[PDB]
């Protein structure tokens, strides 16, 4: 067993690989087309999906960069936003690259508000997308909401130029007395239940003790994150205030055990308004420690167990 071979457990699991496909197509576009396409997607999605305000700490961390753009003339504002999309080497692009996903998302949330209000240079009136860009937007608009928000997040994360790391403060774990316990049809495995419950409580120090020293976590469409230091950093930087709603699973006992669970996850960016269809694929060692866990965004609800 290696981490890279563990990636192959439960090969029937059909991931929503239209998400990375669509990001690859998006990545080819002209920068002005990239910005305009996301503006159109975001405006249309906002007719039915309510996005949460960025956290106060996040907005403080992004404040100096946002102020710099706000002080620019309109041509320079457009150029700064194009620099980010083009992954140009500029001071702003390097600052942006140092930020956690949530800080990048909050930065663009604020620019979108300012563009709507007309205080930052908007997408030009009457703007027409390129041939390739129109088709990329059509693909996004045909996706389930959970896939759409994953495309937007990955587009945002990929901008800027790459190192110092800036992230939001780590919230205290949920008080013991108020914590929920999940139930999973077919799965009583204590490691899997404790995984779900500790993540739901933001209890990352308890969560990390479930792993082997060489264990890995593979987020959707990302390479495995290997070892307790890197996995705990990922938890603290990117995994706060999720709600995991596992539904059902299957347990296949080497003394190792493979377990697959399907259900839904909510991000604090959308709360109950977007339920992403998710699989968890666990490979546990004989002592019950996590050697490998993958989290997959599923192609459709038809992929739930
Ligand atoms: C750019 C841009 C603009 C603004 C864009 C904005 C503002 C977009 C905002 C998008 C947002 C806010 C998206 C949020 C997505 C969040 C997601 C998709 C979260 C998924 C999390 C998952 C699936 C976690 C699962 C996990 C589980 C379950 C585990 O068990 C272990 C941990 C982990 C793996 C993490 C404007 C309009 C100005 C136009 C110009 C360009
Ligand atoms: N950073 C943690 C590491 C840890 C080990 N187990 C749980 N957490 C600590 O200071 O203790
Ligand atoms: Cl999130």
Author numbering: 3 to 164, 169 to 259, 262 to 313
Question: Which lines from the publication concern this structure?
Answer:
In cyanobacteria, carotenoid-dependent non-photochemical quenching is mediated by a unique class of water-soluble carotenoid-binding proteins, the homologs of the Orange Carotenoid Protein (OCP). In the compact dark-adapted orange state (OCPO), the ketocarotenoid is enclosed by two protein domains of about equal size: an all α-helical N-terminal domain (NTD) and a mixed α-helical/β-sheet C-terminal domain (CTD). Upon photoactivation, OCP converts into the physiologically active red state (OCPR) via the formation of numerous intermediates, and the quantum yield of OCPR formation is extremely low (about 0.2%). ICT signatures are valuable indicators for the contribution of the carbonyl group(s) to the conjugated system, and might inform on the configuration of the carotenoid end rings. These effects are of particular interest for the chromophores embedded in OCP since the only specific carotenoid-protein interactions in the OCPO state are two short and strong hydrogen bonds between the 4-keto oxygen of the carotenoid and two hydrogens in the CTD, one belonging to the Tyr-201 hydroxyl group and another to the N-H group of Trp-288 (numbering corresponds to the OCP sequence of Synechocystis sp. PCC 6803).
A 1.37 Å crystal structure of OCP Y201W combined with femtosecond time-resolved absorption spectroscopy, kinetic analysis, and deconvolution of the spectral intermediates, as well as extensive quantum chemical calculations incorporating the effect of the local electric field, highlighted the role of charge-transfer states during OCP photoconversion. To elucidate possible reasons behind the spectral heterogeneity of OCP in its compact orange state, we determined the atomic structure of OCPWW. It crystallized at three different pH values in the same space group P3221, giving three structures with resolutions from 1.37 Å (pH 6.5) to 1.49 Å (pH 5.5). The position and conformation of Trp-288 are identical in WT and OCPWW, indicating the presence of a strong hydrogen bond between the keto oxygen and Trp-288 (the distance between the carotenoid’s keto oxygen and the nitrogen of Trp-288 is 2.9 Å). The electron density for the residue 201 reveals two alternative conformations of the engineered Trp in this position with nearly identical occupancies, nicely supported at this high level of spatial resolution. One Trp-201 conformation has the nitrogen oriented towards the keto group of the carotenoid (‘IN’ conformation), presumably enabling the formation of a weaker hydrogen bond with a distance of 3.2 Å. In the second Trp-201 conformation (‘OUT’), the side chain is rotated by 180° roughly in the same plane, which is incompatible with a hydrogen bond to the keto oxygen of ECN. Analysis of Fo-Fo difference maps shows that IN and OUT Trp-201 rotamers have identical occupancy (within experimental error) each at all probed pHs.
